[PDB]
């Protein structure tokens, strides 16, 4: 039993809710919140900009030190950093950005990072400003993630479409 509330169950292990991931993180304090990161961990907009803003820029400060030490992530890769005031940990995952021409097949690799964590609060990878089709992203999520994932979808209109077109 966990503290996630109001989710619709899609499969054995995937759940979905119309929610602001920032507000959901602050209420649940999950062990892991997933960030929709880029390889430079520059949290300027979308989910990343919102999560970072909610940490009063502490996420960005920590991320800049991470990059200075380790260099950029790979597209499809991830790193675990602090969750600050939002979660115990933040899993920064880099989905492909279609608006940069990155290979959508890397989306499966990106979701594989979730399998290293038993339970996660997450957005749909490569959705929003990353330019992928959120319905495809949901399908890859369901077909790749085996651990328990609670998907927060900010846009109500999109949430309803994801539920209604879900196979
Ligand atoms: N605070 C928030 N802002 C934006 N989105 C949309 C979004 C989804 C996926 C990606 Cl890759 C980029 N952006 C959110 N979903 C849940 N919470 C969100």
Curated annotation (Swiss-Prot):
Activity control mechanisms: Inhibited in vitro by GRL-0617.
Domain Macro: 1-167
Subcellular location: Host endoplasmic reticulum membrane
Membrane topology: Multi-pass membrane protein
Residues of the full protein shown: 1025 to 1191 of 7096
Protein name, UniProt field: Papain-like protease nsp3
Catalytic activity: Thiol-dependent hydrolysis of ester, thioester, amide, peptide and isopeptide bonds formed by the C-terminal Gly of ubiquitin (a 76-residue protein attached to proteins as an intracellular targeting signal)
Quaternary structure, from the entry: May form homohexamers. Interacts with N protein.
Protein task: Responsible for the cleavages located at the N-terminus of the replicase polyprotein. Participates together with nsp4 in the assembly of virally-induced cytoplasmic double-membrane vesicles necessary for viral replication. Antagonizes innate immune induction of type I interferon by blocking the phosphorylation, dimerization and subsequent nuclear translocation of host IRF3. Also prevents host NF-kappa-B signaling. In addition, PL-PRO possesses a deubiquitinating/deISGylating activity and processes both 'Lys-48'- and 'Lys-63'-linked polyubiquitin chains from cellular substrates.
